[PDB]
Symmetry: C3
């Protein structure tokens, strides 16, 4: 069920929630897509040190389901996006939440928007890859979000 989104020097892998009892299969896939680091945006359900073990870096920035990400998180997220793909050309950043339909897709959307896409373009571009990518509240949030390249 791995969802991949590209544009333009950016590449994202939106993924589901793993467990200690399924982390093996989950890492194998990450390694396959050239994932250098993964940003967990939801609640912890497995031990991240196991991932860090295999050479994949981890950043744990969880925020409430449905609710909008803090200013700090959006901030860090964008800093990470801006530098990683430049420092490491062709790499891939995996972001994952529980369902993979709200929180992760939103950070991916804010990245596309900062990259020059209109919000309605960023929403379709993503749903192109993940059927039910956003709920009403989240859509409204993306609609009122103001970028600064």
């Amino acid at each position: 069920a791995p969802v991949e989104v590209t544009y333009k020097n950016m590449r994202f892998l939106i993924t589901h929630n793993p467990t200690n009892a399924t982390l093996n299969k989950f890492i194998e896939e990450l390694k396959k897509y050239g994932v250098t680091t993964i940003v967990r945006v939801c609640e912890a359900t497995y031990d991240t040190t196991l991932v860090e073990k295999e050479g994949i870096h981890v950043l744990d920035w969880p925020f409430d389901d449905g609710a909008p990400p803090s200013n700090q998180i959006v901030d860090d997220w964008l800093s990470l996006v801006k530098i990683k793909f430049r420092e490491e050309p062709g790499c891939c950043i995996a972001v994952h939440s529980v369902a993979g339909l709200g929180r992760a897709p939103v950070l991916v959307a804010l990245a596309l928007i900062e990259g020059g896409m209109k919000y309605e373009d960023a929403v379709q571009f993503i749903r192109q890859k993940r059927r039910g990518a956003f709920n009403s509240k989240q859509l409204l949030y993306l609609e009122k979000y103001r970028p600064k390249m």
Copy 2:
């Protein structure tokens, strides 16, 4: 097996011609892709009343196999496209013919062109999603087509 095409605020779903026996599953799939309105461009082989009842709206704009759509159809189709994606950002409009290689992709192409894409680009864009998407007559039609809006 449904083909999906998107750019930029637009997002289309080209489906096969369902049947009364598979309609229930056909409707669940549409709902999941976020389709609010479907456009049947071919000869009727199933009853749409059940689709209308499940909340999805049907537009019967059939036109001759191989022959180009009339000005009326082209006009209504482009009108629906411009409006629907405006009214419900992030939604999807389903289009379907019989084989899904001619009439259906032709309307999709026209939308993309008025969307700012050159015909050659639109032809390739759709073929990456639907292998043998056009015949010689349909290609010549799209080449001589003059973008209105």
Copy 3:
């Protein structure tokens, strides 16, 4: 499964080595993908004549596995590309290598770069369709490439 890449009026099909001696099905799919020409970049069993007999033009431009293609090859490649897609809009150029992870995607990459994409862009675009499409050498080669302008 077949690795296909589109942009904008260009469309490339990266192929492996025609399985189980039955190049019959290999040719059937090429024709379905609207392939008119095939660029063989490796050197192996492949009844080149059987293919051309079926209607598909074959060009033999083999080069060192891992090493950068010569300037003549890039030259011919680039003209082949510009020519063919203008000549027959909507067609497809197949690129044939051994593993379809190096030599082939590099050429495809050079075409996208010529199309206006920056190398990071072209590297992400292709890996979107083919997981491990480039090795270190190849990535560094594309970083130093400079399109003839």
